[PDB]
Amino acid sequence: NDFHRDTWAEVDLDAIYDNVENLRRLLPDDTHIMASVCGNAYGHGDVQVARTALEAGASRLAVAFLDEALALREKGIEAPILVTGASRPADAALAAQQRIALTVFRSDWLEEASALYSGPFPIHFHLYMDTGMGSLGVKDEEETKRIVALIERHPHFVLEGLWTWFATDYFSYQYTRFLHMLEWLPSRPPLVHCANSAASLRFPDRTFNMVQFGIAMYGLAPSPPYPLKEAFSLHSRLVHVKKLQPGEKVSFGATYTAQTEEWIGTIPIGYKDGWLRRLQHFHVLVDGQKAPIVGRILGDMCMIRLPGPLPVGTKVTLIGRQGDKVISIDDVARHLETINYEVPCTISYRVPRIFFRHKRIMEVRNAIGRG
Amino acid sequence: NDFHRDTWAEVDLDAIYDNVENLRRLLPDDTHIMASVCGNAYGHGDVQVARTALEAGASRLAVAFLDEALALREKGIEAPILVTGASRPADAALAAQQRIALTVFRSDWLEEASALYSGPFPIHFHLYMDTGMGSLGVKDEEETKRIVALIERHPHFVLEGLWTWFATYFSYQYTRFLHMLEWLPSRPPLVHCANSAASLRFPDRTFNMVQFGIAMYGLAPSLPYPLKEAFSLHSRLVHVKKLQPGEKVSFGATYTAQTEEWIGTIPIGYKDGWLRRLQHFHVLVDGQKAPIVGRILGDMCMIRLPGPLPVGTKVTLIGRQGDKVISIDDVARHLETINYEVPCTISYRVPRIFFRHKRIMEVRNAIGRG
Amino acid sequence: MNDFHRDTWAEVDLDAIYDNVENLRRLLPDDTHIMASVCGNAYGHGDVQVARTALEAGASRLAVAFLDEALALREKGIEAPILVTGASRPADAALAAQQRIALTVFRSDWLEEASALYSGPFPIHFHLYMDTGMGSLGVKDEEETKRIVALIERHPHFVLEGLWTWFATYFSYQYTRFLHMLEWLPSRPPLVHCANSAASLRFPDRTFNMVQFGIAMYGLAPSPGPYPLKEAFSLHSRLVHVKKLQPGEKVSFGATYTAQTEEWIGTIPIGYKDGWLRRLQHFHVLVDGQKAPIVGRILGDMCMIRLPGPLPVGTKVTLIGRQGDKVISIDDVARHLETINYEVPCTISYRVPRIFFRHKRIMEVRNAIGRG
Amino acid sequence: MNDFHRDTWAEVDLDAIYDNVENLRRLLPDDTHIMASVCGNAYGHGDVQVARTALEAGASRLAVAFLDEALALREKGIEAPILVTGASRPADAALAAQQRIALTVFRSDWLEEASALYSGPFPIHFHLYMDTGMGSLGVKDEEETKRIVALIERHPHFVLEGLWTWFATYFSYQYTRFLHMLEWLPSRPPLVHCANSAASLRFPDRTFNMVQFGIAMYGLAPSPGPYPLKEAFSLHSRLVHVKKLQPGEKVSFGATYTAQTEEWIGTIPIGYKDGWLRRLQHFHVLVDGQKAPIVGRILGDMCMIRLPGPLPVGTKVTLIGRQGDKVISIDDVARHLETINYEVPCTISYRVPRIFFRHKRIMEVRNAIGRG
Amino acid sequence: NDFHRDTWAEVDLDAIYDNVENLRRLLPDDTHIMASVCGNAYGHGDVQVARTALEAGASRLAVAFLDEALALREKGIEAPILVTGASRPADAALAAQQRIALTVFRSDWLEEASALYSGPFPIHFHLYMDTGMGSLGVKDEEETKRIVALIERHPHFVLEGLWTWFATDYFSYQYTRFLHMLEWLPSRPPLVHCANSAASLRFPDRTFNMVQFGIAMYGLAPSPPYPLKEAFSLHSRLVHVKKLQPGEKVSFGATYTAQTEEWIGTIPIGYKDGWLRRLQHFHVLVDGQKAPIVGRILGDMCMIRLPGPLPVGTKVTLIGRQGDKVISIDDVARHLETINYEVPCTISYRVPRIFFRHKRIMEVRNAIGRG
Secondary structure, three states: OOOOOEEEEEEHHHHHHHHHHHHHOOOOOEEEEEOOOOOOOOOHHHHHHHHHHHHHHHOOOEEEHHHHHHHHHOOOOOOOEEOOOOOOHHHHHHHHHEEEEEEEHHHHHHHHHHHHHOOOOOOOEEEEEEOOOOOOOOOOOOHHHHHHHHHHHHOEEEEEEEEOOOOOOOOHHHHHHHHHHHOOOOOOOOOOEEEEHHHHOOOOOOOOOOOOHHHHHHHOOOOOOOOOOEEEEEEEEOEEEEEEEOOEEEEOOOOOOOOOOOEEEOOOHHHHOOOOOHHHEEEEEEEEEEEEEOOOOOOEEEEEEEEOOOOOOOEEEEEEOOOOEEEEEEHHHHHOOOOHHHHHHOOOOOOEEEEEEOEEEEEEEEEOOOO | OOOOOEEEEEEEEEHHHHHHHHHHOOOOOEEEEEEOOHHHHHHHHHHHHHHHHHHHHOOOEEEHHHHHHHHHHHHHOOOOEEEEEOHHHHHHHHHHOOOEEEOOOOHHHHHHHHHHHHOOOOOEEEEEEEOOOOOOOOOHHHHHHHHHHHHHOOOOOOEEEEEEEOOOOOHHHHHHHHHOOOOOOOOOOOOEEOOOOOHHHHOOHHHHOEEEHHHHHHHHHHHHHOOOEEEEEEEEEOOEEEEOOOEEEOOOEEEOOOOEEEEEEEEEOOHOOOOOHHHEEEEEEOEEEEOOOOOOOOOOOEEOOOOOOOOOOOOEEEEOOEEEEEEEEHHHHHHHHOOHHHHHHOOOOOEEEEOOOEEEEEEEEOOOOO | OOOOOOOOOOOEEHHHHHHHHHHHHHHOOOOOOOEEOOHHHHOOHHHHHHHHHHHHHOEEEEEOOOHHHHHHHHHHHOOOOOOOOOOOOOHHHHHHHHOEEEEEOHHHHHHHHHHOOOOOOOOEEEEEEEEOOOOOOOOOOHHHHHHHHHHHHHHOOOOEEEOOOEEEOHHHHHHHHHHHHHHHHOOHHHHHHHEEEHHHHHOOOOOOOOOEEOHHOOOOOOOOOOOOOOOEEEEEOOOEEEEEEEOOOOOOOOOEOOOOOOOEEEEEEEHHHHOOOHHHHOOEEEEEOOOEEOOOOOOOOOOOEEOOOOOOOOOOOEEEEEEEEEOEEEEHHHHOOOOOOOHHHHOOOOOOOEEEEEEEEEEEOOOOOOEE | OOOOOOOEEEEEEHHHHHHHHHHHHHOOOOEEEEEOOOOOHHHHHOOHHHHHEEEEEEEEEEEEEEEEEEEEEOOOOOOEEEEOOOOOOHHHHHHHHOOOEEEEEOOOOHHHHHHHHHOOOOOOEEEEEEEEOOOOOOOOOOHHHHHHHHHHHHHEEEEEEEEEEEEEHHHHHHHHHHHHHHOOOOOOOOOOOOOOOOOOHHHOOOOOEEEEEHHHHHHHOOOOOOOOOOOOEEEEEEEEEEEEEEEOEEEEEEEEEEEEOOEEEEEEEOOOHHOOOOOOOEEEEEEOOOOEEEEEEOOOOOEEEEEOOOOOOOOOEEEEEEOOEEEEEEHHHHEEEEEEHHHHHHHHHOOOEEEEEEEEEEEEEEOOOOOO | OOOOOOHHHHHEHHHHHHHHHHHHOOHHHHHHHEEEEEHHHHHHHHHHHHHHHHHHHEEEEOOHHHHHHHHHHHOOOOOOOEEEEOOOOHHHHHHHHEEEEEEEEEHHHHHHHHHHHHOOEEEEEEEEEOOOOOOEEEHHHHHHHHHHHHHHHOOOOOEEEOEEEEOOOOOOOHHHHHHHHHHHOOOOOOEEEEOOOOHHHHOOOOOOOOEEOOOOOOOOOOOOOOOOOOOOOEEOOOOEEEOOOOOEEOOOOOEEEOOOOOEEEEEEOOHHHHHHHHHHHHHHEEEEEEEEEEOOOOOOOOOOOOOOOOOOOOOEEEEEEEOOEEHHHHHHHHHHOOOOOOOHHHHOOOOOOOEEOOOOEEEEOOOOOOO
């Protein structure tokens, strides 16, 4: 709800709405769109992103483990949800009562589940096929047969889907093998899909009747027809400004020595906020200009060298646009020497999220706010 | 409450209790101990750590910004709390109502607070003195005098204390503090400092309250009593694949087996705070050091097992497993950062299990139902 | 849980509220909004009940005296726009912004303070109150108006939504004086209104695209004097005891009372703690269709009335309202009290239940001190 | 959530309540209970706050005017015994019984009706109110007393807990008349008390093992005149606007006001909707330590005062209480209003926050219309 | 809380307090007392009875299945609780987090449990030994060994107890066999107990360090030093009375013909209240006299022939005392041709319970009351 530190993230839900609407137009009315909202929508806000996606065209959601699926249900999400990661056989009943589909990786798992669950709710499963270069998943025809047999036998089990993850030139091997495995099934599952496939993201396949719109939904390219809009931005404000004389010292994480007369500003964001120490020499946007982060990043604050004296309260943009200049997630990731996925995800619970929709503030989410 | 993924953190509150208890001895019965629980107790659990510290002898708590203090109050903590970072003057009433003390860095700030606030609750302020190498704080007698004047005049303003942060030399800042301290008409009820290697070791002051920083968590921020580490991180294998010589595995990149081996996948990734730079780090499984192979994904990472191991086998990322042990400093070293950052990065989606007296006290799942 | 356990209550006929506003909505052009005033818990009629009835009848905006009253409405489900017409603290702008509540500004100094202490993220809507020279507050000159306009245009989250004034009840002078102040603004604000203007309720005035239906919305003539206004508030109680007295007999109900002749005295459970002030000591109430004088001093929780012959316990007494062909209006009570009508319903305390009627059928009962 | 957003509030010094009762508890013998009266939301001081303070100071029982007030106390955690001193419905006996609330009985007919409609399972405690001849209600003869006694002894769940009367303020006559009515009972009831007896507050009277600390508990003399009583209620506001006027200048605040000379007028956010009635139009308030007259008519949410020279916005105005060496008591307000002290605090509306002080430190703030 | 039909049950908690206090005095300070509160305390009120028992001397509670144990925890009971009946292996985690001990009947069950549960809470088990004439339980040394092995291996499993049910002249066989089985355990479990043993209910055994105070705690003899006090009573009131002339007819469930001038009274209790139809010719107490139930018992009412005309509101006692006359549970059971256990248990949720303590009403429990 309300927050009391001048540091926050903004989530432009129109960027998310637009991205999904454009994909919904491109793909044939036959293909479903599954929106990925794991890790609290990659740090964007699980329920806010989920509703916007469903509203724009998505029809199903994907999360990493059971708790993320239960969080969506509790917050009012009624659309289908698939747990793409591992789960405990003992939780079958729970997932079943909550109408949450689960992915199966081993026949061994389904047997445990079929043995400790008798009903009354029907539980839907999706099989993850290991095409041969994976670390997990169904690996052979024998195993595939055991799984199919356990489902048709059990009165509450339902084989809803089949999918796999395509690594990114192994596409050949990983596809011919998949097509081969898909034939081991007596009949074609209601939903055939896959993840991390730029191919089925632009060109139609048809072997797949559901596409997984992963990180691209957030305007981030998963690997460096319509443009993608970035939805995440990060801001803060100067809470102090100190003028330094030449030669003067200031001990941030280490020791900084002013080479000339300059002004140092402190903003209330640090590595506890997910603004990692490696961003030690990155720059930020203040008063429309670029300003360098000097000295080490502290736990709850970091210092920036200002062009001249600015008043406390001046807005600082860490990720986003100011004037004609811009800083994107890729820029931050590049400086950190990591992938864009990791950036928004690392922005901790401590930082409130402000959601915009139709160029207008919709709501504020302060994970540690009162209530 | 409950959790449904085999990944979790453990917080030994006995480690917290003992660390505070030890410091409670070395310090004279006249000096308060202030426990810092900012950042949700550095990833350990704000209310849990807070209560434990208060039981072991601590009397006040410190957080970085107002929302953290308000959260501690909403959770039932009644002990005095000090906001060490910046706050908005327009929030003075809110702070006063909740009995939250605030740190003052400029006279302009108080000037605004004074005009915006009229009562009826009293607001306790702590003056932060800039000895010289800081990025903020009060530094001249002129401003210090303005602050003392604003408070005296205001019916609901109270100068509760003054402090400074000793960066790490110490000899200069010290005498400089004593000098600045003498500017005040009357010595404040509380005079404390933060990050003082000598305030821990040695008592004696000047200082009737010392800030037990990260040390309370058993992390050396760089003597006459041992410090216990209170944080451990664990997970379990959720799948095991056997590989033949030369067999390939397309993880985050291309990995090739060079012998018969088994690879275990654990349900923890970078979206959990287990950052990608840990791709060549070792974890603990079956009492042995197993290396993380390939790249660390968002929700999972792979490890070469010391041999065939069943699903469910317990994997320890930070902590002890039999004869082997992985400390926080170890992880920090690999990542090339400081220990502080490690636990603080373990995300909200990772449950914390609290132990007290060698036995499980509670579970907290930040995303559990309710 | 809205039950009550004392035979004393007030009745709020929401059909009267609905009809009064519906009539006004008919008269005014579609371009003209109707602002419904619901300060003071809708002048003792029930804030949320009156608000939604006024809204359903054609009103599109609400007005309250201070921030708390606005927050109370939002907490009770009201979503329509709300304007705080009285003073507020600069430091509460954020709270008001977060809650979509507009604030009235009377001094540039106030805005200067609010501008310096607020930075976002919600936009805050302001209405400037102009002092046309004979008031006790408000913007009075062009230089201050410009400073204000400047501050708003300069602040990214500040919005100039309206402008208004209160015409004292010398009107011709104020009206023209207001037109001058209007031109002091670069452009015309989204909403231009005024209050206490009987004229704006009789004839549509192109100058204002929003009119304030003050106390008249409750059927009370804001002054001495197009459509019929119906009152919505009545007050009732019941006899809880009756006693026959002989000539000369004394009774000490606050003061000494001597029965000049054989008579019957009834006691009803309502007193000054209920807002039925002591000054109503010799007013007449309705019982069994007859006017009966309240004799003796009014106590905190009860008062005695001289009855027109024997009557059983449980007999309905009407303090304000109709009984048979006899009627007692709020103005009748005000007159006896030597005060204005506005004050009567507002004084009927929080401990007197309000029974709401809609479509000639009970709708809800709200007992401010009931369990829950 | 007990924050408020208008600079107008009342203060309740619970130390005063504690001290007044503590003094009474010292005087009265251990066999004598003290009943604390908390009807009317503790005469506008806050029911639960005053109740528990009185209880902590030595009072062992509470009194309210009607059932709802008693249910409100129970819902707020009060466990001490409560007596409804006013009328109630026979059909509510079960509810009252279930909640351990005692009821006053004034007529045998009432008990007959309650006996016929209640059968259990909770016991219900009654206190008989005797009319000593000069009252307007209560049991008046021995035959009715016997019928009542009979009904109770006959009903398994009915209990005769007490007997009391109200001595008018002819006392010698009533006292003796009460002793006669007392002997009409087979045995002496567990509790025998009376109300409005200054005597019972000065000297211990073996006839009553429980005394009613009425309004005196609030530091208000129930009449004109052993221990010092301290007042617990003050009322405050702040200037929200100030305007300098020249000689002859006019201001229309309800009525026309002409400045006979250069002067400064301040406006505070409190009006008749807050219980600060219009009749207080020429009363004096405290501002900057000086007495200042309220000039012009009091509006619903504000009133203007003539200031002693220029003063900034935010200056504290004290309507009731002390400022410097000047003081304004409740009796001073009552006098100007031509009413009794009892009525003043009771009239200060539900929308004015009450700030409670205990041990010279703020304890809680209860804003009846605050969020929550 | 409140109820609005003149039919109710009274539970004298002093009867329960006294019974337990007397047993606590008799047994040595070494032996624990386990109070049985299954079936909502045999229709007496689970939480009310549990607290009273713990307060009088009991230290542990027993319920039939998991939900009854969870109901006690939710209502504030923190004392130990044992599920004496069957439970699902998948619920181990739940019982574990709630500190609820479970009974194990097969090694097969423990294996399923040990396989789907890894932690973090310790779960306590009690082994039910089948002495040879049971329908379930551990039957041999091999099975006993497997169970012991699974517990010591698993880091969270704890063997807390061992018990069995003694049928009631097979006591010999069922005891010598039990003593024999008890030796198969490496060490003696912390708690050794048994159920339905009148023997260990009066005379000390010592082989058992915990006695199960079953139905006797309620003042009911489980098979027809200090006396037992009956805690349950049932009442109602006449809601109508009709005078009949000789020869007159009234069609209750069937057809009743008045043989003479008589008065018929109707009370608002029927078989939906658990006042079964077979009580068709039982008698009840009204105005201190016995009165016969005439005509069939209806769903929500039943008729009684009154001595003379009584007013509506007159109290009717179905189980309890009026004047010098009394009706006990055994009387009702005898008429029904069943055991006393079944009577209070059958008194449905529809009938509120009024609890007394120290000859004073403590609280009312109306299962279908508002809230």
